[PDB]
RNA sequence: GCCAGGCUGUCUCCACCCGAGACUCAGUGAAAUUGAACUCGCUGUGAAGAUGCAGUGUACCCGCGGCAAGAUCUGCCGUGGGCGCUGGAGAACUGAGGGGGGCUGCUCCUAGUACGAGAGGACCGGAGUGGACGCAUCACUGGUGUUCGGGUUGUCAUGCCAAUGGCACUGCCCGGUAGCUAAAUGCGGAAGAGAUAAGUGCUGAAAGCAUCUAAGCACGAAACUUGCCCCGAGAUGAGUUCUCCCUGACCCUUUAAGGGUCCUGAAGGAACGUUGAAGACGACGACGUUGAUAGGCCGGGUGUGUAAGCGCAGCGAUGCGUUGAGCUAACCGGUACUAAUGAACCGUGAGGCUUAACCU
RNA sequence: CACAGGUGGUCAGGUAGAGAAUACCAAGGCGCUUGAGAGAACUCGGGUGAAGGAACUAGGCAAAAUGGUGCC
RNA sequence: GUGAAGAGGGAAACAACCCAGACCGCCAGCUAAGGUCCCAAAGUCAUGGUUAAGUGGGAAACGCGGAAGAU
RNA sequence: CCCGGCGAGGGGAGUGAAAAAGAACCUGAAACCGUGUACGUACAAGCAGUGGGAGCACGCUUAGGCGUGUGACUGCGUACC
């Protein structure tokens, strides 16, 4: 779960290090966004040269949540922190071909069939 | 159709073969024998009175003892009514088991919420008044497991009333 | 709130209440009889009965534990020697409470609390 | 009461070994992929044990890609297949929530040598 | 003067815990205001928003806790004492009426389907899955859990070491029993039904055409109401059903819904105790020896973590086997060991008059 | 008013402490003049807490984080 | 002309609208304004006409329409 | 003398014309506080009164419908300066 104005760890080779949330989407008058929800984040630090520039505003999706998510069998997946990967409204395919840390099994969505291939460590 | 009165015992999880954990609340359903029958000609409507449990003879009022003696059954801990669905009738002393819920797959639970003291305006409507000890019903619940020989009923979710409280389980009207 | 919770409030500091109960238990052991309020008497019984039950068994660890919650060497010595064998046959219910009306000072209910044997 | 105790105990399998907190352990988990099921091995260190009847669950932590991931495994759930202890540890602490900050040598623990 | 960063419930959302007030028991106890009050809502008028004027409607009398729309009063929610439902009493309900909400996105098959020259392209509202509200719950995710356990700095005390207890915010922290908790999980915005606007229609002229209508005469919007739950016979129009109890005597008078005396004291309730996941006080639930209602005890479980002592090693810190040991409040199954005694009080002794049908 | 307020100077121990500040004790003085009750909403003084440290507020106003020695 | 300094009855209430100037008492009769379905005292009285919309029981200019009025 | 606490206060006896004169001491009213007596009131809306008014108790001409105590209901009634 992620709230407004929360830092998300970067799990892609785009060069981003610190990203801040600005707006939350995925439901009218919604206060929190889950792991499988689209969020609006910005960039605080950028590499000297690359496709990502400071101040850009674009969509993103959380891959890991500090609070975690539950399972039908009662199991809970909890991570040491919140990790998010930037997404674009057009050309959803993220630039990063490598993702830090494992990922859960809830990424079977229609548009997330291309990310399960990455993240070899589960 | 017709509901039965049971006693809440607790709630836990049930593990499925596929590996899914489901909350289950446990209701002890004693044989709720029928004491009196109400009819259109005499009482103005069709209904049957159900009783359950046991009361000590000393702590049973003489009028209730006489009523149960007329019913030809031992005195229970309470009396409840259920409106018939215009189906087959019943007879006095006809014990009813949980088998009726063995093929419904959808039940509604009515009971008294746990009591609470005075509640503030924010605590009530987010004015102040008594909280709990009020009839409340939760509908569209599916039975998980039925054990007739053990008088055990497991129903998904949560139901009003803490341990030791009495509740009513009725066939789901909505479907 | 107020659901399945043990321990009457007895509005006071927690350490103050603990010291109060220590003094109550020590007095009851020393004199085998107390004349105190029922609300305090109930918790006095609840806190003192474990002490006598533990004292029924004699051991260095048991004596040290009894002294920890008693802080009176003479009272601890009184235990394990007279009360332990006196109530050895009995299991639980080592105290009895008898009401003696309401206190005249402030209409506060008061009662006597004493051991089952209390003598002999 | 008796009924709930019977219901809880009737679904208990005497196969989980007794593992102390902070002891390295491997867990076999059934995972559904496509229309089939397969096995997955998860190695980690047990941090907390909360054995509430059949609700018994233990937290296992692992370090992957430089990040710490902790998952709670249910002791008696069908999803968990078997529990095996590879490296034996010894810590005089029921809960190991303190190691979330430690790393490298500090996070390491000594052999039990019982 | 300004910038970058770390840093807390200021907030999404607040949740829990410790103390003094808030409520009751025994006593002391003043004020501001005060013409008198048997101190209702709406409509119209009025020196112009009427508790007091005309019309209309509702409301048993009197108390306790707050929400402050105007804390004395009006008003609202919850809950109490008295009273009547006509002999009394205990239970179960029909129900005149009353509380409220009927929200909303994505995907799936339908289906790249009908239609459509092609382009284009659904009705579907059937299934699954989100967002916000309410209700329910603590097994799960955790928070709290100063009443449980352990680490640790200073100081005092137990004659001293060891070992213990108090104080220093719970002395500072690490975990956590039960209860409560949302950030956790179960359900609901029904389906169907009635009347429906527009609109869609069988035969059809007057006025050999035509037309929703003149004659026969049919469907239908997410709009409205039932259907969904909850309170409800103080509904004084005071309801319906079941069961139980009383089956004595005598005297007087102003001779009748009369009065009085001895005996009787039924069912039930209240009175007091254990008390509760019931509670501010009331009230409510279970029990009161013919018992698991509270405490303690046995065993288990949870939690904490290898207690003290013993003997070995290091001349010391400390470790080793005893010892997965000791302790464990609120959890679970038993145990009368302790506390709920025998009792007293109210509540009565056949139930008012008239009418109509029955056996007499 | 036995009120919660002001009233001038002196006597100045031990422990850990740079310290007459800080915490417990020595001799000494006191538990302060209403007590007891289940411990509701609510008010006041505090403690902990998942996603955050400034997204409420005109406002970093309360609270909260560190609080030093020598060197690389 | 009224109130000021005049009551009473009617207009549902109402001080300037209509009748009407209270010496006091009486369980008497007759009238002014206003009424004679009730509330509430009086005709559900008679004759000749308008009304199908509760217009009566709120409305102008204008071609029955105009017409929308106060929890 | 007794109750009361070896108090305060009270109850008897006596003195005292009188103690309905007891040191709070001639005469002792209303505001205010209590008991008893008779009546009305717990389905009933507003300056709380005025006429009608059955009923509820007492004494009277021993009925002859009289007065006192209350006023269910009813027409009217928007305080003083």
Curated annotation (Swiss-Prot), chain A:
Q: How does it assemble?
A: Part of the 50S ribosomal subunit. Forms a cluster with proteins L3 and L19. Forms two bridges to the 30S subunit in the 70S ribosome, contacting the 16S rRNA. In pre-50S ribosomal subunits interacts with RsfS, which may inhibit association with the 30S subunit.
- Biological process GO terms, please? cytoplasmic translation
- Name listed for the protein in its UniProt record: Large ribosomal subunit protein uL14
Q: Name one GO molecular function term.
A: large ribosomal subunit rRNA binding
Q: Which family does it belong to?
A: Belongs to the universal ribosomal protein uL14 family.
Protein purpose: Binds to 23S rRNA. Forms part of two intersubunit bridges in the 70S ribosome. In the 3.5 A resolved structures L14 and L19 interact and together make contact with the 16S rRNA in bridges B5 and B8.
Q: Which Pfam families match?
A: Ribosomal_L14
> Domain of life, per the record?
Bacteria
Note the coiled coil stretches, chain numbering. none
Q: Does the keyword Lyase apply?
A: no
Q: What GO cellular component term, any one, is given?
A: cytosolic large ribosomal subunit
Show the InterPro entries listed in the entry.
Ribosomal_uL14, Ribosomal_uL14_bac-type, Ribosomal_uL14_CS, Ribosomal_uL14_sf
What is the native source organism of this protein? Answer: Escherichia coli (strain K12)
Task: Please provide the record's keywords in A-Z order.
Answer: Ribonucleoprotein, Ribosomal protein, RNA-binding, rRNA-binding
The record, for PANTHER family, names: 50S/60S RIBOSOMAL PROTEIN L14/L23, LARGE RIBOSOMAL SUBUNIT PROTEIN UL14M
Per the record, the gene is rplN
From Swiss-Prot, chain B:
Superkingdom per UniProt: Bacteria
Pfam families reported in the protein's UniProt record: Ribosomal_L3 (PF00297)
Q: Provide the record's note on post-translational modification.
A: Methylated by PrmB.
Its GO CC terms are: cytoplasm; cytosol; cytosolic large ribosomal subunit
An example of a GO molecular function for this protein is: rRNA binding
Alphabetized, the UniProt keywords read: Methylation, Ribonucleoprotein, Ribosomal protein, RNA-binding, rRNA-binding
Which SUPFAM superfamilies is this protein grouped with?
A: Translation proteins
Sites bearing N6-succinyllysine, chain numbering: 38
Q: Which InterPro entries match?
A: Ribosomal_uL3, Ribosomal_uL3_bac/org-type, Ribosomal_uL3_CS, Transl_B-barrel_sf
In terms of Gene3D superfamilies, this protein maps to: 3.30.160.810, Translation factors
Annotated GO biological process: cytoplasmic translation; ribosomal large subunit assembly
* PANTHER family associated with the record: 50S RIBOSOMAL PROTEIN L3, LARGE RIBOSOMAL SUBUNIT PROTEIN UL3C
Q: How does it assemble?
A: Part of the 50S ribosomal subunit. Forms a cluster with proteins L14 and L19. In pull-down experiments interacts with CedA.
* Role summary: One of two assembly initiator proteins, it binds directly near the 3'-end of the 23S rRNA, where it nucleates assembly of the 50S subunit.
Q: Which family does it belong to?
A: Belongs to the universal ribosomal protein uL3 family.
Task: Give the protein name, as stated in the record.
Answer: Large ribosomal subunit protein uL3
Q: Per the UniProt entry, what species is this protein from, by scientific name?
A: Escherichia coli (strain K12)
Curated annotation (Swiss-Prot), chain C:
Do you know which SUPFAM superfamilies this protein is assigned to? Answer: Prokaryotic ribosomal protein L17
**UniProt keyword annotations, A-Z:** Ribonucleoprotein, Ribosomal protein
Q: Name one Pfam family in it.
A: Ribosomal_L17
- Which BP terms does GO give this entry? cytoplasmic translation; ribosomal large subunit assembly
Give the top-rank taxon of the lineage listed in the UniProt record for this protein.
Answer: Bacteria
Q: Name one GO molecular function term.
A: structural constituent of ribosome
Record keyword Ribonucleoprotein present: yes
GO cellular component terms, alphabetically, are: cytoplasm; cytosol; cytosolic large ribosomal subunit
Please name the NCBIfam families in this protein's record: L17
- Which family, according to UniProt? Belongs to the bacterial ribosomal protein bL17 family.
Q: What does this protein do?
A: Requires L15 for assembly into the 50S subunit.
How this chain assembles, per its entry, is:
Part of the 50S ribosomal subunit. Contacts protein L32.
Q: What's this protein's name?
A: Large ribosomal subunit protein bL17
From Swiss-Prot, chain D:
Identify one Gene Ontology CC term for this UniProt entry.
cytoplasm
Keyword RNA-binding belongs to the record: yes
Q: SUPFAM superfamilies, alphabetically?
A: Translation proteins SH3-like domain
Which one GO biological process term can you cite for this protein? cytoplasmic translation
Q: Which Pfam family would be a valid example here?
A: Ribosomal_L19
What inducers act on this gene?
Part of the rpsP-rimM-trmD-rplS operon.
- Gene Ontology MF: a single term: structural constituent of ribosome
PROSITE patterns named among the record's database cross-references:
RIBOSOMAL_L19
Q: Which InterPro entries does the UniProt record give?
A: Ribosomal_bL19, Ribosomal_bL19_CS, Ribosomal_bL19_sf, Translation_prot_SH3-like_sf
Question: What keywords were assigned to this record?
Answer: Ribonucleoprotein, Ribosomal protein, RNA-binding, rRNA-binding
Functionally, this protein is described as follows: This protein is located at the 30S-50S ribosomal subunit interface and may play a role in the structure and function of the aminoacyl-tRNA binding site. In the 70S ribosome it has been modeled to make two contacts with the 16S rRNA of the 30S subunit forming part of bridges B6 and B8. In the 3.5 A resolved structures L14 and L19 interact and together make contact with the 16S rRNA. The protein conformation is quite different between the 50S and 70S structures, which may be necessary for translocation.
**Family to which this protein belongs:** Belongs to the bacterial ribosomal protein bL19 family.
Sorted alphabetically, which HAMAP family does this protein's record hold? Ribosomal_bL19 (MF_00402)
* Description of how the protein assembles with itself and partners: Part of the 50S ribosomal subunit. Contacts L14. Forms two bridges to the 30S subunit in the 70S ribosome, contacting the 16S rRNA. In pre-50S ribosomal subunits interacts with RsfS, which may inhibit association with the 30S subunit.
Name of the protein in its database record:
Large ribosomal subunit protein bL19
Gene assigned in the entry: rplS
């Amino acid at each position: 779960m992620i709230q407004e104005q929360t830092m998300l760890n970067v799990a892609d080779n785009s060069g981003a290090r610190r990203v801040m949330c600005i707006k939350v989407l995925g439901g009218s008058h919604r206060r929190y966004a889950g792991v499988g929800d689209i969020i609006k984040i910005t960039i605080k630090e950028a590499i000297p040269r690359g496709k990502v520039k400071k101040g850009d505003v674009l969509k993103a999706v959380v891959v890991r949540t500090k609070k975690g998510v539950r399972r039908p069998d009662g199991s809970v997946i909890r991570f040491d922190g919140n990790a998010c990967v930037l997404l674009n409204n057009n050309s959803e395919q993220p630039i990063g071909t490598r993702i830090f840390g494992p990922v859960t099994r809830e990424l079977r969505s229609e548009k997330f069939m291309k990310i399960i291939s990455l993240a070899p460590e589960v | 159709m017709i509901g039965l009165v049971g006693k809440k015992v607790g709630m836990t999880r049930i593990f499925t073969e596929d590996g899914v954990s489901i909350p289950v609340t446990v209701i002890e359903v004693e044989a709720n024998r029928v004491t009196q029958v109400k009819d259109l000609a005499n009482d103005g409507y069709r209904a049957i009175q159900v009783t359950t449990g046991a009361k000590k003879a000393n702590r049973v009022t003489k009028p209730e003892a006489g009523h149960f003696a007329k019913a030809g059954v031992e005195a229970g801990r309470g009396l409840w009514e259920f409106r018939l669905a215009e189906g087959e009738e019943f007879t006095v002393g006809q014990s009813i088991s949980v088998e009726l819920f063995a093929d419904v797959k959808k039940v509604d639970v009515t009971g008294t919420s746990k009591g609470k003291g005075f509640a503030g305006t924010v605590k009530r409507w987010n004015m102040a008044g008594q909280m709990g000890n009020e009839r409340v019903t939760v509908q569209s619940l599916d039975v998980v497991r039925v054990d007739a020989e053990r008088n055990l009923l497991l129903v998904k979710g949560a139901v009003p009333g803490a341990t030791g409280s009495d509740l009513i389980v009725k066939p789901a009207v909505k479907a | 709130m107020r659901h399945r919770k043990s321990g009457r409030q007895l509005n006071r500091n927690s350490s103050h209440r603990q010291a109060m109960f220590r003094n109550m238990a020590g007095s009851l052991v020393r004199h085998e009889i107390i004349k105190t309020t029922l609300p305090k008497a109930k918790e006095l019984r609840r806190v003192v009965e474990p002490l006598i039950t533990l004292a029924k068994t004699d051991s260095v660890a048991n004596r040290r534990l009894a002294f920890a919650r008693t802080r009176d060497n003479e009272i601890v010595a009184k235990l394990f020697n007279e009360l332990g064998p006196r109530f050895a046959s009995r299991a639980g219910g080592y105290t009895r409470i008898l009401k003696c009306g309401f206190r005249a000072g402030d209409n506060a209910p008061m009662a006597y609390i004493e051991l089952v044997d209390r003598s002999e | 009461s008796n009924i709930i105790k019977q219901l809880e105990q009737e679904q208990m399998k005497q196969d989980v070994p007794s593992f102390r907190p902070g002891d390295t352990v491997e867990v076999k988990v059934w995972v559904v992929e496509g229309s089939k099921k397969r096995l997955q091995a998860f190695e980690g260190v047990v941090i907390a044990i909360r054995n509430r009847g059949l609700h018994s669950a233990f937290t296992v932590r692992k370090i992957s890609n430089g990040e710490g991931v902790e998952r709670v495994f249910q002791t008696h759930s069908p999803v968990v297949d078997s529990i095996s202890v590879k490296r034996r540890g010894a810590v005089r602490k029921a809960k190991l929530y303190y190691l979330r900050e430690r790393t490298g040598k500090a996070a390491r623990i000594k052999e039990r040598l019982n």
